[PDB]
Amino acid sequence: MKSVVTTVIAAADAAGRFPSSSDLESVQGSIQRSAARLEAAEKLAGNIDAVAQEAYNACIQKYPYLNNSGEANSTDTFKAKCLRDVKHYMRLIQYSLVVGGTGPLDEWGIAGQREVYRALGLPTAPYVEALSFARNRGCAPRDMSAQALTEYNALLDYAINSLS
Amino acid sequence: MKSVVTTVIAAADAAGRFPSSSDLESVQGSIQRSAARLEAAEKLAGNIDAVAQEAYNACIQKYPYLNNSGEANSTDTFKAKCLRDVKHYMRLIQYSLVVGGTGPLDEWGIAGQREVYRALGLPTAPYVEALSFARNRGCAPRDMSAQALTEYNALLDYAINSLS
Amino acid sequence: MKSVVTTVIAAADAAGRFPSSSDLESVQGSIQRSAARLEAAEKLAGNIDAVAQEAYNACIQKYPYLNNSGEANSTDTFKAKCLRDVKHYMRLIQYSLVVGGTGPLDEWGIAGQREVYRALGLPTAPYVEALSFARNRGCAPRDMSAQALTEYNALLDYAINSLS
Amino acid sequence: MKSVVTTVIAAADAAGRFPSSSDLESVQGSIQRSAARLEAAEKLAGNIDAVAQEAYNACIQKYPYLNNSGEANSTDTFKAKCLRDVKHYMRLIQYSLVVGGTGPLDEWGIAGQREVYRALGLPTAPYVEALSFARNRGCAPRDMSAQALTEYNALLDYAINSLS
Amino acid sequence: MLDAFSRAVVQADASTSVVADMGALKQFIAEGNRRLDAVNAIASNASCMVSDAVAGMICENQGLIQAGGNCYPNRRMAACLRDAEIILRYVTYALLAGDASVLDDRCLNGLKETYAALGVPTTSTVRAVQIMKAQAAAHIKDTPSEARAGGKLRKMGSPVVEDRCASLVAEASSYFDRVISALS
Amino acid sequence: MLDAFSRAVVQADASTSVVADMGALKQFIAEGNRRLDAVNAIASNASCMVSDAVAGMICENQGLIQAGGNCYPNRRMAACLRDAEIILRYVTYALLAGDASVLDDRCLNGLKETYAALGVPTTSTVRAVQIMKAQAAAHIKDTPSEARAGGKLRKMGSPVVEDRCASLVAEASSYFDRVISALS
Amino acid sequence: MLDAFSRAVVQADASTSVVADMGALKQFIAEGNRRLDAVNAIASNASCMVSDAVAGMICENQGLIQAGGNCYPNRRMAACLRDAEIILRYVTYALLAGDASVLDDRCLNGLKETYAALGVPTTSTVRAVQIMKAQAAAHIKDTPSEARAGGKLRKMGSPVVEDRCASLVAEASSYFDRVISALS
Amino acid sequence: MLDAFSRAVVQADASTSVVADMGALKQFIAEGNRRLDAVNAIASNASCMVSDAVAGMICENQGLIQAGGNCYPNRRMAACLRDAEIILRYVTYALLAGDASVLDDRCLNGLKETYAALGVPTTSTVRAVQIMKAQAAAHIKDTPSEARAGGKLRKMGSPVVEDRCASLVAEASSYFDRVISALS
């Protein structure tokens, strides 16, 4: 699971090395940046339902054709799954804020996503719009500090890039 | 050359990734730890000759047989080389403090050292003793701060471990 | 284990060949040379303790610093182990004379030697001097035939090379 | 070209080794066996036309159908080429006795032989009979010493095996 | 690869000397947070940048999307998009490291010869890289325009200073210039 | 591999729930400098630890260096020294990460079976590990004795607290105990 | 692989002792020329031996060359011929070395399982190996019969002794028995 | 690779003729024991030769061990020691075979071009090979000097003849000259 520490351990192990000076220095970066990313993680842990609900609503507002017969937001099951999927991305962003690398999002969100959505005929633009809404929505210090918001926004952009 | 940033870049490149959260976080560690290691680097840059001279002196005091006819410190040229060698290690330590990883020591000191010393009949114990003397010599706050001295000592132990 | 016959069998097997002319001819060389090397092996078998003792004694005479507190010949246990080690190399030489290839010395003496002596901070120069003494000591016809002595000396020089 | 010495060199090179005891011992086998094989080589060099002629005559005696219309010994050009081919094998045997390994026979006779004879519709049994006649013909000490004859016969059987 | 600090060490080693000027190195550290922001600004906008740059290259040279053109058929368009991303990726590594060596060594060396053997057109390659250079400068300054953003505008929200990180803009632009230099 | 933070994530993902407990995470961060000192204390002393542990295993069990012993001949001694280093290396990774997964996955899984196929004696392996555990504890606490240091004593110079990093000593010891459990 | 001499050294090494008793070893040297003749006798006749042995196996069991038989169709007959030759080749290596290790390590290990998975019949394989054992005995003694030679008789012309190399015949035979036992 | 005898066979095959001149080949055989002594003389002293030669090359050119020198830093010194040993190894193979083919084919072909691309200096490589040539000549003749032996003198003890193996010294020296000519 990609984080600061697992990246440097994997590099050390590939070379048969004990942890050395740059490995310790890297982990000091986690000590320093952790406050911002855990602040965002805590915000998101407390308010993920509302955050996901509004992002979902925004993507349907953008693309009302999804409500038409045969389309991906058209049935009660579909509506529930689409909201659930937005919440899954947010949860994986919460995890990635906890870890301080993209591992959770990479392994549990991104890997396979394109194949799944192609198979099920799910368009990617609504996913992008939900995440895009969420990315443009936050402001500091209203919602969280400026650096917490930097961390949150970076993970949303990471997700957006993976679907673009 | 191994450092915080080249390690993360190499890991990113192997996976076809742009820099991501854990890469930036790792580099913040360099921002943080730099003061300590650069303090040590400055001290060593300003006093390298005296530091090497006393460490060299200590290894010959330990192993006076090196002066006896035929041995590795017994002539003027040999004497000069041995002191020079001790200074090379301390210069590579200075470089490693600047870089924040062991790259300079690895690439320009450690690689090949055992084969060179073997071929030339040069015993490794006196190298270890010079570095050991240097490792036990420093104290804080006299010579530098406690964390500068931690950086300095860790690289000396890195070099000692390479020869042990 | 490397010998005349295992070398030619390995080469034949790699090519899917029965033994052929050059394989048989190689083994004729063992029939011819065995007299010299087995003579040396029998001499060494019958006098190994004295031969190793004088080699050990020579290496300590060259390096009296080994007797000093904290050095590798400084305790009764260490003195016994050093003599033992010299005897191990002579025993492996005896085995190599029996086999007619360097297999026993390569597999049971040389492989790992550098790593062992490094880890224990044992200097290699005393091993080299013991073997060197042994190499320069014999003369023919006093000790054995001139071709026997050639065989014995060649294996001592093979061991010296491995440590040099 | 496979010989005693090239086999041990190739094995030493694959392992990054200088020549060692078993390599020298193998070559002493060539010093010893060379008398036998160079005796056979000398006799064959001096009498190759007669040796080849009678072997060729024997193979046609065994297979007179080869003289019939359309068969492989039925024209003057075919007759000349068949005898020439018998002589080629005997010359390669002569070379193999000189080298002390099968290299010249392997590379210049055996390699490709089955493809060539198949393409031209040439039966192998007459080749085998020529070599078989040659193999059963010699006697010692009339033609050469018993050990020279053993070398000659072994290469003839090596050639027969390659065609059987 | 090297970084800005090992680059200084290589220069010192040329005269078997200690690194004595702590000044420029302490400047790298002082601007370290800005440098992280600059990298974030590019990486965070990379898909948009690549797509827009390749599209721009094409709208300025329609021959690329007609028979015989090097972004025709779909396979070639795809390969071009991939390359523009690769290039931007290695530029971003150079900016994180504060040194061009990873870009030079892992992306640029052999690129001219590779493209010449394939018939990838230099003129158009240059334009794609120029557009990415301009995009990168705007994102580092956090001044992208609505006019160029095609409904996809992003603001980074870093602490603003009057020069808008001019030295980092210049450095980033120098790396894009190295890409272009490597084609001739 | 996992680390202490991704461990919490995997536990939460098992119930597709957010990570709610920030306090435990913040405690990891608060002891981060002491953790880095603990790792530095082992890594810095690793050659001395390994050699002393293997030598101690041998002085307590002379069978290992006598005929048919598993540290005879040189090749076997060298393999053993290498193994003790490998085990210490993966224990130190586990301590840096705050999680045993790298040690389980990359070192311990399959190792008991590998050793049974080679005949590497379990009681001696365990003893080498026990010695390394005791060394690690003393170096983390920065209280090695002269009596065990063989004239090679090192002082770390970390800032002293009354408990001398008891929690990290217990955690490091737990990783050595995991090795012992897996291999016996 | 080991040879007769290295086998003796492995014995001595088990007690960390010099090789003192050299009588058996000096006998190997005194019988070395006859061992080379024994090897030459088998290698020189190997194609005849293999073909005759597989043909004998078959003439004693026509099921092998009928529907469902393990030497039917041509590819199976060819594979059988190839195997008999492989086996004979490794037996000759064992005889040259004076030690079965090459044969056990490089030929016999896993052979039973291989044949089981393929359905190669043990009874028939054993008979082929038994025929080759008899052939090799007669060629080592240099007493093949015209009756069994099918117009292809060869005489080796080695110097005759009363026992006709009984010791080497027994040793060769033991290697063939080892092949058979590996299928038991 | 070829040896002295297969070289003669290649020459004979160029006119599809038997090898008739047995004399030069019977001279090879007569000098075989001295050839094995000559190879033993070099192989047995190889470490001392290589280290002394490379040290000699350096003491005559101190530029090699200064900044920018091709034996600086440790890695380059090691690579150079490795190469001198490789070269000597291949020369010794050629002397054992009595033919340069192994040396030309496996060591010298492409070597000058390899060194040019790396910037390995020619004059210095030649010097190291010159010193090894001179050492080899002394060891073959069994007349090394105390002056040059640095307290590591070895005597071979081979049976002395008045010419001290003049033909083999010329031959060995010719192989070293081949190396030097290939690198010049």
Ligand SMILES: *C(=C)C1=C(C)[C@@H](Cc2[nH]c(/C=C3N=C(/C=C4\NC(=O)[C@H](C)[C@H]4[C@@H](*)C)C(C)=C\3CCC(=O)O)c(CCC(=O)O)c2C)NC1=O
């Ligand atoms: C074809 C008709 C054609 C185009 C396609 C387009 C290409 C083009 N783009 C620019 C400049 C920029 N594009 C930017 C991209 C983005 N901004 C964002 O906010 C999102 C994240 C992203 C993707 C849309 C940016 C930042 C710029 C920089 C300038 C600015 O922001 O104002 C150019 C100009 C390049 C140059 O200066 O040489 C071009 C040509 N133009 C077309 O004609």
Ligand SMILES: *C(=C)C1=C(C)[C@@H](Cc2[nH]c(/C=C3N=C(/C=C4\NC(=O)[C@H](C)[C@H]4[C@@H](*)C)C(C)=C\3CCC(=O)O)c(CCC(=O)O)c2C)NC1=O
């Ligand atoms: C054989 C006669 C034999 C030994 C060899 C020795 C092995 C042994 N070692 C310990 C404990 C420690 N060894 C330590 C090592 C070092 N300390 C240093 O300062 C340097 C860097 C390094 C290498 C020498 C350390 C730190 C300890 C911890 C205890 C302490 O410091 O006081 C033990 C005890 C292990 C246990 O408690 O189970 C043993 C057995 N002893 C021998 O008998």
Ligand SMILES: *C(=C)C1=C(C)[C@@H](Cc2[nH]c(/C=C3N=C(/C=C4\NC(=O)[C@H](C)[C@H]4[C@@H](*)C)C(C)=C\3CCC(=O)O)c(CCC(=O)O)c2C)NC1=O
């Ligand atoms: C099928 C009708 C059938 C056979 C085919 C044949 C098989 C068989 N062969 C032997 C014994 C030997 N065969 C030998 C082979 C050869 N002798 C030579 O001179 C040439 C070079 C070579 C190939 C033809 C030899 C040497 C023997 C040994 C005995 C001897 O020489 O007298 C046997 C007997 C096996 C046994 O004893 O168990 C068999 C069965 N027999 C068939 O029925």
Ligand SMILES: *C(=C)C1=C(C)[C@@H](Cc2[nH]c(/C=C3N=C(/C=C4\NC(=O)[C@H](C)[C@H]4[C@@H](*)C)C(C)=C\3CCC(=O)O)c(CCC(=O)O)c2C)NC1=O
């Ligand atoms: C540096 C100032 C410097 C040197 C280092 C040295 C290099 C050098 N060495 C020789 C000649 C030989 N060296 C030999 C080596 C050995 N002899 C032994 O007995 C042992 C086993 C071995 C290792 C020490 C030998 C055999 C010679 C041959 C000459 C001799 O024996 O007298 C030379 C001379 C090369 C030549 O003749 O062209 C040089 C330059 N000299 C330095 O100045």
Ligand SMILES: *[C@@H](C)[C@H]1/C(=C/C2=NC(=C\c3[nH]c(C[C@H]4NC(=O)C(C=C)=C4C)c(C)c3CCC(=O)O)/C(CCC(=O)O)=C2C)NC(=O)[C@@H]1C
């Ligand atoms: C040009 C690049 C920008 C700009 C950037 C500035 N950033 C400044 C401060 C700052 N940035 C960060 C985030 C950065 N550090 C990290 O550790 C990580 C990720 C791990 C990132 C992305 C931090 C933490 C800080 C310091 C805190 C703060 O000041 O709020 C900054 C001010 C300091 C300086 O002058 O260098 C600037 C100028 N500014 C601009 O005007 C353009 C748009």
Ligand SMILES: *[C@@H](C)[C@H]1/C(=C/C2=NC(=C\c3[nH]c(C[C@H]4NC(=O)C(C=C)=C4C)c(C)c3CCC(=O)O)/C(CCC(=O)O)=C2C)NC(=O)[C@@H]1C
């Ligand atoms: C048990 C491990 C020790 C012990 C350790 C303590 N270390 C404390 C502080 C500290 N350590 C470092 C160095 C560390 N941080 C890094 O970034 C790097 C390398 C990149 C390393 C090696 C720093 C920077 C600090 C903080 C500065 C300081 O306090 O001086 C520390 C105090 C904080 C705390 O209570 O956690 C402790 C206790 N202490 C002991 O008693 C044993 C010997």
Ligand SMILES: *[C@@H](C)[C@H]1/C(=C/C2=NC(=C\c3[nH]c(C[C@H]4NC(=O)C(C=C)=C4C)c(C)c3CCC(=O)O)/C(CCC(=O)O)=C2C)NC(=O)[C@@H]1C
């Ligand atoms: C059972 C195997 C035989 C038999 C064999 C004997 N061979 C004897 C002597 C002998 N054989 C060779 C040839 C051999 N040596 C080589 O170097 C090579 C190839 C490179 C081969 C093939 C030599 C040189 C000699 C020695 C000279 C001589 O004796 O003429 C031999 C006599 C010595 C002894 O008793 O061991 C025997 C008995 N004898 C038999 O009766 C069966 C058929």
Ligand SMILES: *[C@@H](C)[C@H]1/C(=C/C2=NC(=C\c3[nH]c(C[C@H]4NC(=O)C(C=C)=C4C)c(C)c3CCC(=O)O)/C(CCC(=O)O)=C2C)NC(=O)[C@@H]1C
């Ligand atoms: C120049 C190279 C020397 C020198 C050499 C001579 N060696 C002579 C004889 C000889 N050497 C050996 C050992 C050799 N044969 C082997 O089988 C093996 C290893 C397997 C080796 C190392 C033997 C067995 C013999 C024959 C026994 C003997 O003569 O004592 C030799 C004399 C014969 C000849 O003239 O060719 C010479 C001259 N002599 C010199 O002056 C320089 C130093």
Ligand SMILES: *[C@H](C)[C@H]1/C(=C/C2=NC(=C\c3[nH]c(C[C@H]4NC(=O)C(C=C)=C4C)c(C)c3CCC(=O)O)/C(CCC(=O)O)=C2C)NC(=O)[C@@H]1C
């Ligand atoms: C800065 C003043 C902005 C801006 C911000 C507004 N946000 C408003 C409501 C709102 N925002 C969110 C997302 C936020 N909550 C979280 O928990 C997280 C992340 C974990 C984020 C980023 C939510 C769920 C809500 C609704 C609940 C709430 O009021 O907090 C808001 C109120 C009016 C509105 O809903 O638009 C404002 C004003 N508004 C701006 O125009 C500037 C650019």
Ligand SMILES: *[C@H](C)[C@H]1/C(=C/C2=NC(=C\c3[nH]c(C[C@H]4NC(=O)C(C=C)=C4C)c(C)c3CCC(=O)O)/C(CCC(=O)O)=C2C)NC(=O)[C@@H]1C
């Ligand atoms: C703490 C008070 C120690 C202690 C320290 C002493 N060190 C003394 C001299 C000394 N130390 C060094 C090494 C130091 N200089 C550097 O530039 C660097 C690293 C870059 C280090 C680690 C040198 C070269 C010297 C000699 C020059 C000088 O005096 O500064 C020293 C003076 C007396 C002496 O030489 O021993 C002391 C007192 N002494 C102690 O007793 C505690 C444990």
Ligand SMILES: *[C@H](C)[C@H]1/C(=C/C2=NC(=C\c3[nH]c(C[C@H]4NC(=O)C(C=C)=C4C)c(C)c3CCC(=O)O)/C(CCC(=O)O)=C2C)NC(=O)[C@@H]1C
């Ligand atoms: C001092 C603690 C020793 C000692 C040392 C001597 N070293 C000798 C030669 C030598 N040293 C090195 C390593 C050095 N060169 C580098 O480029 C670097 C790192 C960048 C280092 C650390 C090399 C490569 C060499 C060989 C080339 C040369 O001569 O410079 C030396 C001369 C040995 C000889 O010529 O026979 C000595 C005496 N002497 C002592 O007593 C202790 C063991």
Ligand SMILES: *[C@H](C)[C@H]1/C(=C/C2=NC(=C\c3[nH]c(C[C@H]4NC(=O)C(C=C)=C4C)c(C)c3CCC(=O)O)/C(CCC(=O)O)=C2C)NC(=O)[C@@H]1C
């Ligand atoms: C040739 C005349 C030499 C020389 C030789 C001397 N050796 C003496 C004693 C001696 N040598 C050995 C080693 C020898 N014994 C073995 O078993 C083996 C190999 C297996 C070898 C090489 C031993 C153990 C001894 C002591 C017992 C004994 O006397 O045999 C010796 C006696 C005086 C002395 O001890 O130095 C001589 C004269 N001396 C020379 O000066 C020329 C060059």
Ligand SMILES: *[C@H](C)[C@H]1/C(=C/C2=NC(=C\c3[nH]c(C[C@H]4NC(=O)C(C=C)=C4C)c(C)c3CCC(=O)O)/C(CCC(=O)O)=C2C)NC(=O)[C@@H]1C
């Ligand atoms: C042993 C006494 C045999 C036997 C042998 C005879 N061979 C006869 C003639 C003959 N043999 C060869 C082949 C021979 N010459 C060579 O140069 C070489 C190898 C290089 C070999 C193996 C030739 C070419 C000839 C014809 C020329 C000649 O007379 O030498 C021979 C004469 C009568 C005949 O032609 O058969 C005999 C007696 N004869 C026997 O009865 C026993 C079993």
Ligand SMILES: O=P([O-])([O-])O
């Ligand atoms: O993984 P993906 O499916 O390619 O997104």
Ligand SMILES: O=P([O-])([O-])O
């Ligand atoms: O690299 P090294 O030589 O092994 O130290």
Ligand SMILES: O=P([O-])([O-])O
């Ligand atoms: O094996 P080594 O350790 O390299 O001697």
